[PDB]
Design a binder for these strands. Structure first.
Ligand SMILES: Cc1cn([C@H]2C[C@H](O)[C@@H](COP(=O)(O)OP(=O)(O)OP(=O)(O)O)O2)c(=O)[nH]c1=O
Ligand SMILES: [Ca+2]
Ligand SMILES: [Ca+2]
Ligand SMILES: [Ca+2]
Ligand SMILES: [Ca+2]
Ligand SMILES: [Ca+2]
Ligand SMILES: [Ca+2]
Ligand code: NA
Ligand code: NA
Ligand code: NA
Ligand code: NA
Ligand code: NA
Ligand code: NA
Length: 899
DNA sequence: GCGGACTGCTTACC
């Protein structure tokens, strides 16, 4: 097989690399890499190297990496540019692996681990590491085994061995319900003291050294705690055995927080993977909370506080440690962020941990792309931060909208890049710009007949291929493939959801199919014969396939969009606001241009004139009021809801899209662009159910609307799905129960009507005080707590949630055992009625947790339900209903005087 | 006593 790297590090004049050889074995080699950098030279000096602008350069080979660094500094002192890859690790990887890396994941040691630390005095600071590590579970992906290190003897208690029999038993059975599919993969090891556990762990680590190291919060807790604990006990030299190169780096942040860097290891903390790649914003990021959200597994329920869990129930203590490690594996099997990371990493030829940085990722990609043409990359330069203009957003008239069709452009900014051919080395020149609306209205003089143009004034060559458009097209093509798989899985999902209305009573088995492809007629035929058993399991498998596809497409989308954004970041080698602005300005033109073209087409094809059909639009989308389109054919001529949905689908697909294609084709001509790539396709088909009192949709303002959707990008929903953007139902700061209640109000408004809404509202208002306090608590990040802390009391302009935290601190003040609110993390927030014993109007505590028993009963007693209902529920509901022009409560009328 | 304008903070949409 082709060789491929695992990890790479620069240590002085040496590149330390771990790699899988052509025989499949893991090796490690120390290479004294001789890097090359470049300097401009006279034209007369023949060469094969040129910078991206065509200027010749001479290659400077250095005896070592240190000599190359010094040269860079002297070239700075002289005042001349030093070209080439200054991150020598990237240069090494590029040289060593001059080919598309095909890797074998089964050969990469992926380690998932989690540790337990009993601490009687609050959170055990990893920097201090004063308390014993009394449990470690370490999953090795090559062995496919859970290595469990259990401390039986500790200054905090002596305990019996953990029982795997009991662990496997149902909770109802007194057991721990450690998933049966892993019981056989557990390798259990008890220890009579910590030193022996730790030393044993280090020896295990040496035989099975992680390449990818992950887990939940491993970077901020597990790793630094293990490192410092071992360092405190055995000394630093022993601690450094955690690095296959015996080199670590302690980077410190004073508030004492430490982040350790283990050379030769790529740490991908899963919480960081999840935050960057999941596209969620969660009220809490405890593994308990995320596991529930992702896998629908129950919360690991134990009696008593964690600080006393080991002493009282060591059996469950260890089982929960094992389960916590497995839950991250389960989440990854679903989301597949480790696969994504490996993929990206080997594509760009970077350290795997650098997938968190789109700039490093693209710098490496572009660099490799340019290296192949014997071209030389420019030196990084210093730039001041500058604001610059972005997308256009249409101000919508607040109102209801019965029938709505939406259209969106495909990969807008990356497409704009490819079309215009925007790249650092494809810049041709500039032109005198007319006001933006002159280009939008097609009044302005054609910018150029020789070059490709943006309305920001930039001109680019139409013949020369750009390195940026070239490499952004490659990833875009990947993105497009996976989206195909995603949508197919989605369409298959719906097919199964409908079939679940004819559950055929029988004992059957789930059909063998690749959900990434639209079910064949044969398969669709079979499906209509299965029962809830086989159907529900195919639905699950279809949804897992869809999610896997989502991860792959949405993060390649993120990557390419991040290349756009990078052009607007001063730390990007190819930073250039000429290009970044060329993209955004072109975008503003494109959108408002098609707004006009679409309006023109519809006023004509409908017959009317001067009517505004586009009611809203954001960046690259338009929402077309389709009332007049439906009215033409009249509602009578429709058999059911699905009928007119078919109608609009066909209408948009047959008439509107070709018209839009024509509109953009002309625009591309106007700007003399390299290639027409403005592909606007239909998005949503929304409207109330046929013959109902539902309003279909509504807008309250920019980025705040709801739509009752029947079709989305070709997927016809078995049941109508609510598309809600911006509204309180979508925000993580909104209490769970309020989100749910607000959503039902919206569903009722859009699907059923005013009467139904008032019915539900009256009900919710009556019963809402029985809601669990957590479900009705607000959520918020807690930044700069100390900034507003004046003697434990709110300083000037102290934010509401911060006030709540202070209230909390005072309430628990003194109790070293009470849960502490962490700077930067999130908190639940509740209002307290006047006269409460807390001495303030609100209180806050760490999100995703029950508030400490110390004060729980008092908080429950003094909750201000009235303020809760009015601030979090009624006010937003008032905004929804006012805009749509409805009332959530029956108004008083002249009829109120009749019996 | 408190509404309207401005600010900080937070969390959306693209
Ligand atoms: C979502 C998102 C969009 N944008 C910009 C660039 C996008 O092209 C533009 C529109 O975003 P989107 O229309 O939401 O997504 P997309 O057009 O890039 O690709 P697709 O529609 O097929 O899913 O807004 C960002 O810069 N960053 C982002 O995270
Ligand atoms: Ca011993
Ligand atoms: Ca788009
Ligand atoms: Ca059936
Ligand atoms: Ca054209
Ligand atoms: Ca099309
Ligand atoms: Ca689309
Ligand atoms: Na833990
Ligand atoms: Na159970
Ligand atoms: Na120490
Ligand atoms: Na049937
Ligand atoms: Na006309
Ligand atoms: Na969009």
């Amino acid at each position: 097989m082709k060789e491929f790297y695992l990890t790479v590090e620069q240590i002085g004049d040496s590149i330390f690399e771990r790699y899988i050889d052509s025989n499949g074995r893991e090796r490690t080699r120390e290479v004294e890499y001789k890097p090359s950098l470049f300097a401009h030279c006279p034209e007369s000096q023949a060469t094969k190297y040129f910078d991206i602008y065509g200027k010749p350069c001479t290659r400077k080979l250095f005896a070592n990496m240190r000599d190359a660094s010094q040269w860079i500094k002297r070239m700075e002192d002289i005042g001349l540019e030093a070209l080439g890859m200054d991150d020598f690790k990237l240069a090494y990887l590029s040289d060593t692996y001059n080919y598309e890396i095909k890797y074998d994941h089964t050969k990469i040691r992926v380690a998932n681990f989690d540790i337990e630390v009993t601490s009687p005095d609050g959170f055990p600071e990893p920097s201090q590491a004063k308390h014993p590590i009394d449990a470690i579970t370490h999953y090795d992906s090559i062995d496919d085994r859970f290595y469990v290190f259990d401390l039986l003897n500790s200054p905090y208690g002596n305990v019996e061995e953990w029982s795997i029999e009991i662990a496997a038993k149902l909770q109802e059975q007194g057991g721990d319900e450690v998933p049966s599919e892993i019981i056989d993969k557990i390798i259990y090891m008890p220890f009579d003291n910590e030193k022996e556990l730790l030393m044993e762990y280090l020896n295990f680590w040496q035989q099975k050294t992680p390449v990818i190291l992950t887990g939940w919060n491993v970077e901020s807790f597990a790793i630094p705690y293990v490192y410092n604990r071992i360092k405190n006990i055995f000394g630093e030299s022993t601690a450094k055995r955690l690095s296959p190169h015996r080199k670590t780096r302690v980077k410190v942040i004073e508030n004492s927080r430490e982040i350790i860097t283990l050379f030769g290891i790529s740490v991908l903390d899963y919480i960081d993977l999840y935050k960057k790649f999941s596209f969620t914003n969660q009220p809490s990021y405890s593994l308990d909370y995320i596991s529930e959200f992702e896998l629908n597994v129950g919360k690991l329920k134990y009696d008593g506080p964690i600080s006393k869990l080991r002493e009282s129930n060591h059996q469950r203590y260890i089982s929960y440690n094992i389960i916590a490690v497995y839950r991250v594996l389960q989440i990854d099997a679903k989301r597949q962020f480790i696969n994504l990371s490996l993929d990206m990493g080997y594509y760009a030829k970077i350290q795997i941990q650098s997938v968190f940085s789109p700039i490093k990722t693209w710098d490496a990609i572009i660099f490799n792309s340019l290296k192949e043409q014997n071209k030389v990359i420019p030196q990084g330069r210093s730039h001041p931060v500058q604001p610059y203009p972005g997308a256009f957003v249409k101000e919508p008239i607040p109102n209801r909208y019965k029938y709505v069709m939406s259209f969106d452009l495909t990969s807008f900014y990356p497409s704009i890049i490819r079309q215009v051919n925007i790249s650092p080395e494809t810049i041709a020149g500039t032109f005198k710009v007319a006001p933006l609306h002159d280009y939008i209205n097609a009044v302005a003089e054609r910018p150029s007949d020789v070059y490709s143009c943006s309305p920001n004034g930039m001109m680019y060559y139409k013949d020369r291929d750009g390195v940026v458009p070239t490499e952004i097209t490659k990833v875009f093509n990947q993105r497009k493939e996976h989206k195909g798989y995603m949508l197919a899985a989605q369409r298959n999902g719906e097919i199964i959801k409908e079939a679940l209305h004819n559950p055929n009573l029988s004992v059957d088995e789930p059909l063998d199919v690749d959900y990434r492809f639209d079910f064949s007629d044969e398969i669709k035929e079979k499906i209509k014969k299965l029962s809830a058993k086989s159907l529900n399991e195919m639905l699950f498998r279809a949804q897992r396939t869809e999610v896997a596809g989502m991860t792959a497409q949405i993060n390649r989308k993120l990557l390419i969009n991040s290349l756009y954004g990078a052009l607007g970041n001063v730390w990007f080698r190819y930073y250039d606001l000429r290009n970044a602005t060329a993209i955004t300005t072109f975008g503003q033109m494109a959108l408002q241009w098609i707004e006009r073209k679409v309006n023109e087409y519809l006023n004509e094809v409908c017959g009317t004139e001067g009517e505004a059909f586009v009611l809203y639009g954001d960046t690259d989308s338009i929402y077309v009021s389709a009332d007049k389109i439906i009215d033409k054919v009249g509602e009578s001529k429709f058999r059911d809801t699905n009928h007119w949905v078919d109608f609009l689908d066909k209408f948009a697909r047959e008439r509107m899209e070709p018209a839009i294609d024509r509109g953009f084709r002309e625009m591309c001509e106007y700007m003399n662009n390299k290639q027409h790539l403005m592909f606007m396709d239909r998005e949503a088909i929304a409207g109330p159910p046929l013959g109902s009192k539902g309003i279909g949709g509504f807008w309250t303002g920019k980025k705040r609307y709801a739509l009752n959707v029947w079709d989305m990008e070709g997927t016809r929903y078995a049941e109508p799905k609510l598309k809600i953007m911006g509204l309180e139902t979508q925000k993580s700061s909104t209490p769970k129960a309020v989100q749910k209640a607000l959503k039902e109000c919206i569903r009722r408004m859009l699907q059923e009507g005013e009467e139904s809404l008032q019915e539900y509202f009256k009900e919710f208002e009556k019963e809402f005080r029985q809601l669990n306090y957590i479900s009705i608590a607000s959520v918020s990040s807690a930044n700069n707590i100390a900034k507003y802390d004046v003697g434990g009391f709110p300083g000037p302009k102290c934010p509401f949630h911060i006030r709540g935290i202070l209230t909390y601190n005072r309430a628990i003040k003194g109790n070293i055992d009470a849960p502490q609110v962490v700077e930067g993390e999130k908190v639940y927030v509740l209002p307290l009625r006047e006269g409460n014993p807390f001495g303030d109007k609100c209180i806050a505590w760490p999100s995703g947790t029950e508030i400490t028993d110390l004060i729980k009963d008092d908080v429950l007693h003094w909750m201000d339900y009235t303020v809760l209902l009015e601030k979090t529920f009624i006010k937003p509901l008032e905004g929804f209903t006012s805009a749509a022009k409805l009332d959530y409560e029956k108004k008083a009328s002249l009829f109120d005087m009749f019996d």
